[model samples]
Target chain A: AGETVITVVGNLVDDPELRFTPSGAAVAKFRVASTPRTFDRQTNEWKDGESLFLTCSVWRQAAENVAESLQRGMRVIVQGRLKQRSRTVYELDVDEVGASLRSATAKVTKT
Target chain B: AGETVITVVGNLVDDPELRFTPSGAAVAKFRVASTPRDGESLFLTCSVWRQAAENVAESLQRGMRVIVQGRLKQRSTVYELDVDEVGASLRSATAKVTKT
Candidate 1:
């Protein structure tokens, strides 16, 4: 509640890379890039936009699920709290994530 | 396709205000207020176009907690969310979601 929270909807830049802490808590890291749609006035039609590339990390059980369930190029929705590592390196502290539908129809068992 | 993606998890300042363009496209706008660092804060408006606009106009109101995801953009110096998705917070309260 004190810091910032964010949601990222995009494709995984690659398959989630999974690792574990010394304490054995699972962690999965992935990258996401979102491209916005621009309505170009001159063209009088919508045009493709650029991509915002950000890396995210999900911990614990969510990490386990992400590794098992998701793949590269599968459009997904990730909601996370935001944090900074360096002066400019922004990161997402993922709370939950899911495979989006159309981007369709696959999921974990939700244990 | 490039822009800033930001999420606002906050309380609504007012009920959504809806407007229809001359071409009859519907847009719904709502503001989210948050106290970053538990101090004096930032409030940014998020806008929804098309069916989602109508959905938000009907679903949310002032003081309700919701999660909004959008591409961050600026109107002059003021920042805003060009809303991609809006969802009622189940932690804040449960919602009965119906497909549009």
Candidate 2:
């Protein structure tokens, strides 16, 4: 495959933090609480809901724009590639932004 | 910001096809049918079980390689981004051989 595209649908645990690198590149950081709802043959019955918390970082202009538009408690549809930077943290480089609820507006803030 | 990482957890629809460009660059092609388990998506629906044509072209084919950074973009029903440069194109790109 050329590039892997992953989609994460979940609720934001908290508002995203927007920051800039020394070189002036923009970065947006946030956490998503994704719960797997399906059952697996290995585990048998629909295993206890497993919550996967992902730390997502949006880069450059898109990163900065997402930081301005999204907030905590809002249900979002994040599409991008799956990338793991550190042993403990996996990030979704968000490409597209959409809301599950048509009129949902997040509680916006800046850090 | 640094590099942006994206993860795709889904079954491969077909075996990847490998080829080399005129300049001796390598490329791989494949497609993935990603279904949206939830609702209100423009791309796919189970009631419809519609398949999205991705036409993925991979520059690197090694089983595992270091991730690269790029922009994220949306074009109607498809989500993608175009690169002006490879940041070095995995510079010395090569393939992994199989015993079989």
Candidate 3:
């Protein structure tokens, strides 16, 4: 068994929905939208390209931390494994989540 | 406009097809198969440009595992990854960086 690791940078579409599993483990779900930018050499400017949307799931302490630190419209960088459960169903099982320094600054609250 | 950067790890499904644009810029295209434990597999088309395209053509082979970072793109009904950076996946293979 192997995992497909991936990293995605996008804006959170909504506040994270946190819930506990029946076994008492915490999980959070959210959506992210990423718009691609391309340079137009002819115009000497950048243009917006197609956007990709993905659903993400975070677990345990990280899920709790994400719920506390992030909100809708906040840009973030997420690294994780891509998991597809069925036809037309996919998710990113997030391992590392953080604010994107390219767009905004953050005050790190050490845990 | 904002850009969405994504990283993907998978295995090449075939040898990369390399070609030059009309302007002489290099491009390479390939497909990758990503199979997750306990999940369905996904096939993603990937394209690399310029120096990266040249390097990928020379260094990678079919069935080799790789890690790539890029923008996820869609044209019509097809999904493609416009790769920004790529390399061998160290979890299953090793590589040496000769130059920065």
Question: Across the candidates, what are chain A's individual TM-scores?
Answer: 0.88, 0.69, 0.92
- Candidate 1's C-alpha lDDT? 0.73
Q: Write the per-residue lDDT of candidate 1 for residues B1-100, one digit (tens) a residue.
A: 7888776667789999999989997898888997667888789988888776776777678886666677999886888899876655432242333434
| Each prediction's whole-model lDDT (CA) | 0.73, 0.46, 0.74
Q: Report the lDDT tens digits of candidate 3 across residue range B1-100.
A: 3767777767899999999999998898999888898598888999988876776776677887666778998898998999876654423232332221
lDDT of 3 at A29: 92
Off by over 4 Å in 3: B1-100
Kindly list the per-residue Cα lDDT of model 1 for residues A25-66, writing each as its tens digit. Answer: 999999988778879899899887888887989888768767
Residue lDDT tens for model 3, A11-104: 8899989999999988889998989998999999999988888899988876777777678887666778998786568789986665543323
Model 2: docking quality category? incorrect
Cα lDDT tens digits, model 2, A1-111, are: 666677666777998898999999988888888777767899687764878887777777656555655678755556677877654656787654433321231221222
CA error at residue A111 for candidate 1, angstroms = 1.6
TM-score of chain A of 2: 0.69
True interface contacts retained by model 1: 0.02
Index of the highest-lDDT prediction: 3
lDDT of 3: 0.74
- Evaluate fnat for each of the predicted models and list the values in order: 0.02, 0.01, 0.02
